[PDB]
Short mmCIF file of C-alpha atoms and ligand atoms in Angstrom, two decimals:
data_model
loop_
_atom_site.label_atom_id
_atom_site.label_comp_id
_atom_site.label_asym_id
_atom_site.label_seq_id
_atom_site.Cartn_x
_atom_site.Cartn_y
_atom_site.Cartn_z
CA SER A 2 198.20 65.54 19.95
CA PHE A 3 197.53 62.14 21.72
CA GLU A 4 197.85 59.34 19.09
CA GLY A 5 195.61 56.89 21.06
CA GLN A 6 198.10 54.52 22.80
CA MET A 7 199.46 54.76 26.37
CA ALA A 8 202.98 53.12 26.70
CA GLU A 9 201.77 51.05 29.70
CA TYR A 10 198.71 49.45 27.95
CA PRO A 11 199.48 49.78 24.23
CA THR A 12 196.79 47.20 23.18
CA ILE A 13 193.87 49.58 23.99
CA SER A 14 193.16 52.74 21.98
CA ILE A 15 191.66 55.91 23.50
CA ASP A 16 190.15 58.86 21.57
CA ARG A 17 192.01 57.86 18.32
CA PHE A 18 190.92 55.09 15.91
CA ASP A 19 193.24 55.41 12.79
CA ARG A 20 196.68 53.93 11.85
CA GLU A 21 198.22 51.83 14.71
CA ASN A 22 194.84 52.08 16.64
CA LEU A 23 193.20 49.74 14.05
CA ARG A 24 194.93 46.80 15.94
CA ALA A 25 193.45 47.68 19.43
CA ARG A 26 191.93 44.84 21.56
CA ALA A 27 189.45 47.45 22.92
CA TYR A 28 188.48 51.09 22.24
CA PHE A 29 187.57 53.94 24.66
CA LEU A 30 185.87 57.30 23.97
CA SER A 31 186.24 59.91 26.77
CA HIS A 32 183.67 62.29 25.15
CA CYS A 33 181.63 62.99 21.97
CA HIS A 34 183.88 65.77 20.47
CA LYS A 35 185.09 65.36 16.82
CA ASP A 36 188.73 66.15 17.89
CA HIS A 37 188.60 62.84 19.91
CA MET A 38 186.81 60.69 17.24
CA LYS A 39 189.43 60.68 14.40
CA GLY A 40 189.04 57.41 12.38
CA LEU A 41 185.95 56.34 14.42
CA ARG A 42 183.92 55.76 11.19
CA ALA A 43 186.73 55.00 8.66
CA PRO A 44 185.36 52.25 6.31
CA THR A 45 188.51 50.21 7.28
CA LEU A 46 187.43 50.18 11.01
CA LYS A 47 183.83 49.13 10.09
CA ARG A 48 185.61 46.28 8.15
CA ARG A 49 187.95 45.43 11.11
CA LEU A 50 184.78 45.21 13.32
CA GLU A 51 182.92 42.72 11.01
CA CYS A 52 186.06 40.38 11.08
CA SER A 53 187.15 40.83 14.80
CA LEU A 54 183.76 40.26 16.59
CA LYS A 55 185.34 40.55 20.12
CA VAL A 56 186.51 44.23 19.77
CA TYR A 57 184.26 46.73 21.67
CA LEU A 58 184.10 50.52 22.38
CA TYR A 59 183.73 51.58 26.10
CA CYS A 60 182.41 55.06 27.18
CA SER A 61 179.89 56.75 29.62
CA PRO A 62 176.13 56.08 29.19
CA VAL A 63 175.70 59.73 28.01
CA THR A 64 178.60 59.45 25.44
CA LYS A 65 176.92 56.21 24.08
CA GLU A 66 173.55 58.06 23.70
CA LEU A 67 175.16 61.11 21.97
CA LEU A 68 177.31 58.98 19.56
CA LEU A 69 174.37 56.64 18.58
CA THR A 70 172.11 59.66 17.74
CA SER A 71 174.41 60.54 14.75
CA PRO A 72 173.51 58.22 11.79
CA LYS A 73 177.19 57.86 10.63
CA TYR A 74 178.01 55.95 13.94
CA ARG A 75 175.03 53.48 13.99
CA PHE A 76 177.34 50.62 12.79
CA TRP A 77 178.70 50.83 16.43
CA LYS A 78 175.12 50.27 17.81
CA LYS A 79 175.76 46.63 19.01
CA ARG A 80 179.54 47.03 19.74
CA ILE A 81 179.38 49.80 22.47
CA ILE A 82 179.53 48.83 26.19
CA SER A 83 178.62 51.83 28.41
CA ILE A 84 180.19 51.78 31.95
CA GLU A 85 178.49 53.77 34.79
CA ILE A 86 180.58 56.60 36.39
CA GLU A 87 182.71 55.78 39.51
CA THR A 88 182.26 51.95 39.01
CA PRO A 89 185.57 50.00 38.76
CA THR A 90 184.88 47.43 35.94
CA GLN A 91 187.10 44.44 34.92
CA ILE A 92 187.69 44.22 31.08
CA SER A 93 189.11 41.04 29.35
CA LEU A 94 191.56 42.10 26.55
CA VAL A 95 192.07 39.08 24.21
CA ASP A 96 194.37 39.06 21.12
CA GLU A 97 192.46 37.34 18.31
CA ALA A 98 195.71 36.32 16.46
CA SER A 99 197.92 34.97 19.35
CA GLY A 100 195.25 33.96 21.99
CA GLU A 101 196.98 36.19 24.62
CA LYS A 102 194.54 37.39 27.37
CA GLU A 103 195.23 40.45 29.66
CA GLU A 104 192.90 41.65 32.50
CA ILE A 105 192.51 45.41 33.23
CA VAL A 106 190.25 47.39 35.65
CA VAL A 107 188.84 50.74 34.39
CA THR A 108 187.11 53.49 36.44
CA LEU A 109 185.26 56.37 34.71
CA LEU A 110 185.69 59.68 36.68
CA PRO A 111 183.61 62.82 35.82
CA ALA A 112 185.74 65.22 33.65
CA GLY A 113 183.39 68.30 33.87
CA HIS A 114 184.02 69.15 30.20
CA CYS A 115 180.69 68.26 28.43
CA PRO A 116 177.78 65.78 28.89
CA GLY A 117 179.22 62.20 29.20
CA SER A 118 182.86 63.49 29.49
CA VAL A 119 184.97 61.07 31.62
CA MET A 120 188.57 60.46 32.65
CA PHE A 121 189.72 56.78 32.50
CA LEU A 122 191.68 55.38 35.49
CA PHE A 123 193.38 52.10 34.40
CA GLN A 124 194.64 49.52 36.93
CA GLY A 125 196.40 46.33 35.72
CA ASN A 126 199.71 44.43 35.44
CA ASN A 127 201.82 47.45 34.30
CA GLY A 128 200.87 50.09 36.92
CA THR A 129 198.01 52.55 37.44
CA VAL A 130 197.48 55.18 34.70
CA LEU A 131 195.04 58.12 34.36
CA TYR A 132 193.86 59.32 30.91
CA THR A 133 192.03 62.64 31.61
CA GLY A 134 190.53 63.19 28.14
CA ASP A 135 189.40 66.86 28.00
CA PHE A 136 188.80 68.10 31.62
CA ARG A 137 187.87 71.21 33.66
CA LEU A 138 188.25 70.56 37.43
CA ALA A 139 188.22 73.39 40.04
CA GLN A 140 191.25 73.56 42.47
CA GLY A 141 191.08 70.71 45.08
CA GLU A 142 188.72 68.59 42.88
CA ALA A 143 191.20 65.64 42.47
CA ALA A 144 191.56 65.51 46.34
CA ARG A 145 187.72 64.97 46.60
CA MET A 146 187.62 62.08 44.01
CA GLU A 147 187.25 58.93 46.24
CA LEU A 148 188.36 56.48 43.50
CA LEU A 149 191.71 58.35 43.00
CA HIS A 150 192.45 57.25 46.63
CA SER A 151 193.35 54.06 48.55
CA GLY A 152 193.18 54.12 52.40
CA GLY A 153 192.62 57.92 52.45
CA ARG A 154 195.72 58.88 50.32
CA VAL A 155 196.26 59.38 46.55
CA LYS A 156 196.88 56.11 44.63
CA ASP A 157 200.39 55.36 43.28
CA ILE A 158 199.81 56.63 39.69
CA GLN A 159 202.64 55.72 37.27
CA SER A 160 201.47 57.98 34.39
CA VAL A 161 198.93 60.79 33.77
CA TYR A 162 197.86 61.52 30.16
CA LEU A 163 196.65 65.14 30.73
CA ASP A 164 194.55 67.78 28.79
CA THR A 165 197.19 70.60 28.43
CA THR A 166 194.97 73.04 26.36
CA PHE A 167 195.96 75.99 28.66
CA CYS A 168 199.29 74.56 30.05
CA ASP A 169 201.15 77.94 30.18
CA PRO A 170 201.32 80.54 33.01
CA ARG A 171 199.72 83.02 30.49
CA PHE A 172 196.36 81.28 31.38
CA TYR A 173 196.98 81.47 35.14
CA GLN A 174 193.30 81.66 36.27
CA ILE A 175 189.92 81.38 34.50
CA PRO A 176 186.64 82.42 36.21
CA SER A 177 184.84 79.41 37.75
CA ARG A 178 181.82 77.58 36.24
CA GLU A 179 179.51 79.39 38.77
CA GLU A 180 180.86 82.97 38.16
CA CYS A 181 180.52 82.47 34.35
CA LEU A 182 176.88 81.26 34.72
CA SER A 183 176.12 84.11 37.25
CA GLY A 184 177.40 86.79 34.79
CA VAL A 185 175.39 85.37 31.80
CA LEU A 186 172.23 84.85 33.96
CA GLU A 187 172.34 88.53 35.09
CA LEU A 188 172.97 90.04 31.59
CA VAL A 189 170.15 87.83 30.10
CA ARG A 190 167.73 88.80 32.97
CA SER A 191 168.62 92.56 32.56
CA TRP A 192 167.69 92.32 28.83
CA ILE A 193 164.63 90.02 28.55
CA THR A 194 162.75 91.55 31.59
CA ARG A 195 162.69 94.93 29.66
CA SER A 196 159.84 93.81 27.29
CA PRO A 197 158.51 90.56 25.74
CA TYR A 198 160.22 91.76 22.48
CA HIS A 199 163.76 91.80 24.09
CA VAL A 200 165.49 88.46 23.13
CA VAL A 201 168.99 86.90 23.58
CA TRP A 202 171.00 85.00 20.92
CA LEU A 203 173.58 82.68 22.65
CA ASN A 204 176.22 82.39 19.86
CA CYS A 205 177.68 78.94 20.81
CA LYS A 206 179.98 76.68 18.68
CA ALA A 207 178.23 73.53 17.29
CA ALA A 208 179.65 71.15 19.99
CA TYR A 209 178.46 69.54 23.27
CA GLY A 210 179.32 71.50 26.46
CA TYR A 211 176.99 74.60 26.57
CA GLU A 212 174.01 72.47 27.87
CA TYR A 213 174.60 73.52 31.53
CA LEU A 214 174.43 77.23 30.54
CA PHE A 215 171.04 76.57 28.79
CA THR A 216 169.86 74.39 31.75
CA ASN A 217 170.70 77.10 34.35
CA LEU A 218 169.24 80.05 32.28
CA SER A 219 166.06 77.93 31.75
CA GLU A 220 165.66 76.96 35.48
CA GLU A 221 166.40 80.49 36.87
CA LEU A 222 164.31 82.49 34.27
CA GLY A 223 161.56 79.85 33.56
CA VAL A 224 162.27 80.19 29.77
CA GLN A 225 163.18 77.19 27.50
CA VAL A 226 166.21 77.66 25.11
CA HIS A 227 165.60 77.45 21.34
CA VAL A 228 167.94 74.96 19.52
CA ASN A 229 168.23 73.57 15.91
CA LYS A 230 167.90 69.90 17.05
CA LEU A 231 167.31 68.29 20.50
CA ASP A 232 166.83 64.63 19.30
CA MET A 233 170.29 63.68 20.80
CA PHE A 234 168.73 64.49 24.25
CA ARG A 235 165.45 62.51 23.64
CA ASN A 236 166.40 59.93 26.40
CA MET A 237 167.95 62.67 28.67
CA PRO A 238 165.11 64.55 30.45
CA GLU A 239 167.38 66.69 32.77
CA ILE A 240 168.65 68.59 29.61
CA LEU A 241 165.72 68.15 27.17
CA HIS A 242 163.03 69.95 29.32
CA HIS A 243 165.26 73.12 29.25
CA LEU A 244 165.31 73.13 25.38
CA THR A 245 162.62 73.66 22.65
CA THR A 246 162.38 73.77 18.81
CA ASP A 247 159.53 76.32 19.38
CA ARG A 248 160.98 79.74 18.28
CA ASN A 249 158.48 81.62 20.56
CA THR A 250 161.09 82.14 23.35
CA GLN A 251 163.25 85.10 24.49
CA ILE A 252 166.45 82.88 24.61
CA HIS A 253 167.88 81.43 21.35
CA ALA A 254 170.94 79.15 20.89
CA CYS A 255 169.95 78.28 17.28
CA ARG A 256 172.66 78.25 14.55
CA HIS A 257 172.81 79.17 10.85
CA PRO A 258 175.75 79.44 8.39
CA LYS A 259 174.85 83.19 7.95
CA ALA A 260 173.97 83.87 11.65
CA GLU A 261 176.42 86.86 11.67
CA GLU A 262 174.76 88.47 8.58
CA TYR A 263 171.30 87.66 10.13
CA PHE A 264 172.35 89.45 13.38
CA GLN A 265 173.39 92.58 11.38
CA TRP A 266 169.75 92.63 10.09
CA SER A 267 168.14 91.96 13.58
CA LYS A 268 167.15 88.42 12.46
CA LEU A 269 167.65 85.36 14.75
CA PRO A 270 169.46 82.37 13.14
CA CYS A 271 166.11 80.44 13.02
CA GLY A 272 164.86 83.23 10.69
CA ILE A 273 162.47 85.48 12.75
CA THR A 274 162.85 89.31 13.01
CA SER A 275 159.48 89.97 14.74
CA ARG A 276 156.60 88.68 16.93
CA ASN A 277 152.96 89.80 16.22
CA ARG A 278 154.54 92.14 13.53
CA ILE A 279 156.60 93.89 16.32
CA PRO A 280 160.42 93.77 15.69
CA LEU A 281 162.55 91.94 18.29
CA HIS A 282 165.46 93.67 20.07
CA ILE A 283 168.29 91.13 19.94
CA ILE A 284 171.56 91.04 21.90
CA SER A 285 174.24 88.43 21.08
CA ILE A 286 176.14 86.73 23.95
CA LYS A 287 179.24 84.78 22.72
CA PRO A 288 180.83 82.40 25.29
CA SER A 289 184.62 83.00 24.94
CA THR A 290 187.56 81.91 27.16
CA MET A 291 188.92 84.76 29.28
CA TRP A 292 191.89 84.38 31.62
CA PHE A 293 193.81 86.47 34.22
CA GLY A 294 197.54 86.51 35.18
CA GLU A 295 198.80 85.57 38.71
CA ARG A 296 198.45 89.25 39.84
CA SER A 297 194.72 88.60 40.59
CA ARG A 298 193.36 91.95 39.13
CA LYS A 299 190.49 89.98 37.48
CA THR A 300 187.88 91.85 35.33
CA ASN A 301 184.15 91.29 34.59
CA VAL A 302 183.22 87.88 32.92
CA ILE A 303 180.80 89.94 30.69
CA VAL A 304 182.58 92.14 28.10
CA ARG A 305 180.51 94.45 25.78
CA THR A 306 181.69 94.24 22.13
CA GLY A 307 179.24 96.73 20.53
CA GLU A 308 175.77 98.33 20.66
CA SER A 309 174.05 94.87 20.96
CA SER A 310 176.95 92.33 21.38
CA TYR A 311 178.69 90.78 24.43
CA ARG A 312 181.38 88.18 25.13
CA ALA A 313 180.83 85.98 28.27
CA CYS A 314 183.67 84.05 30.00
CA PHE A 315 183.30 80.28 29.41
CA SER A 316 185.96 77.48 29.37
CA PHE A 317 185.77 73.76 28.50
CA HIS A 318 189.37 73.32 29.82
CA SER A 319 191.31 73.72 33.07
CA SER A 320 193.41 76.89 33.67
CA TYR A 321 197.20 76.64 34.26
CA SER A 322 196.47 76.98 38.06
CA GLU A 323 193.93 74.08 37.93
CA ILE A 324 196.35 71.86 35.88
CA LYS A 325 199.21 72.48 38.41
CA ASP A 326 196.92 71.79 41.45
CA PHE A 327 195.56 68.59 39.79
CA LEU A 328 198.99 67.18 38.75
CA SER A 329 200.79 68.47 41.98
CA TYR A 330 198.18 66.59 44.05
CA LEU A 331 198.38 63.29 42.09
CA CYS A 332 202.24 63.41 41.93
CA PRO A 333 202.49 60.65 39.29
CA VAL A 334 205.88 59.28 38.12
CA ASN A 335 205.16 60.61 34.54
CA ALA A 336 202.90 63.31 33.03
CA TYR A 337 202.30 63.39 29.24
CA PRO A 338 200.50 66.28 27.52
CA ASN A 339 197.45 65.26 25.39
CA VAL A 340 198.08 68.41 23.22
CA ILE A 341 200.87 70.92 22.43
CA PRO A 342 198.97 74.20 21.78
CA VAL A 343 199.94 76.57 18.88
CA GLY A 344 201.76 79.11 21.18
CA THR A 345 204.00 76.62 23.10
CA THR A 346 206.36 73.63 22.53
CA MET A 347 206.71 70.08 23.93
CA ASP A 348 209.87 71.39 25.72
CA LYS A 349 208.06 74.25 27.57
CA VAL A 350 205.02 72.03 28.51
CA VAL A 351 207.39 69.27 29.87
CA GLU A 352 209.40 72.01 31.79
CA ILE A 353 205.99 72.88 33.45
CA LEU A 354 204.95 69.17 33.98
CA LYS A 355 208.33 67.69 35.17
CA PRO A 356 208.53 69.51 38.58
CA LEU A 357 204.97 68.32 39.59
CA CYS A 358 205.89 64.62 39.02
CA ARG A 359 207.64 62.36 41.54
CA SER A 360 211.22 63.36 42.61
ZN1 ZN B 1 186.56 68.13 24.02
ZN1 ZN B 2 166.03 80.53 17.33
#
């Protein structure tokens, strides 16, 4: 897994804040997932901060909002500089100990992974590098990103630090964002139009990224989504007005440590079985990655798992096909995997990445 330092600009730390990253001249956070925040509130880094007053964390406006909602990250409050998307910004890296100054230009590109998720394009004295963080980009998407181009053609990119979550031909294709939403929208409509007592439980992991499912169910069916907490979205109206803490809705994305046991007893995670003494009829819809081999005999994005239970195709990460199209297109000198998944090896991932790089 990425240990925070790119060879080309070793004095900045991205998405890793422990060990050798405690010496960084500047910090970057691609997105507000725990996987990418290791060390970010170690006492020793809070200490580092108080002594080195010229060290800052850079991220999207949305990532800043989501990080500064959580009380354990409020010590960052005055040391976070948000940079607007698609806005090449010059950063002054200064070494406190030696007085050495380096100048670097950073561009935040949308990563399509969760609210505030960005890729970081770095331009300075040691070549152009792209850190993707976690990303999901449809085929052709890189070719339509203006700031990956100079004079109509792809920039000379020395190195790409790439999300390789599904970097194996096993995961050849994954249904698109729009097919996944279409399949969930239709199942939810088919259920909740039957009677006011027919309700959906969206069984989502406790992590940013499902907001656009809630947003699109809410818009299309005129029904707000029940959630445990929405205070992270208090300064984010485009999301917030699709959510509610009011349990009087037919669409729930609430959570509870015993939600599975609750479901067995026709109880929603927020604790209701009934409305006006009438029992609810609950179905569970569990977003779950589904994939299809090269032979394109794709199946339904909805899969029924029991009397009242469904899985729905959903992915936070690019398919093998999307990774190859993205890297193929950029044709960097070097590609480095941000992760080696449990079922593959560094050797097999590099054997996939090497042919898509220059020469
Ligand atoms: Zn992530
Ligand atoms: Zn609920």
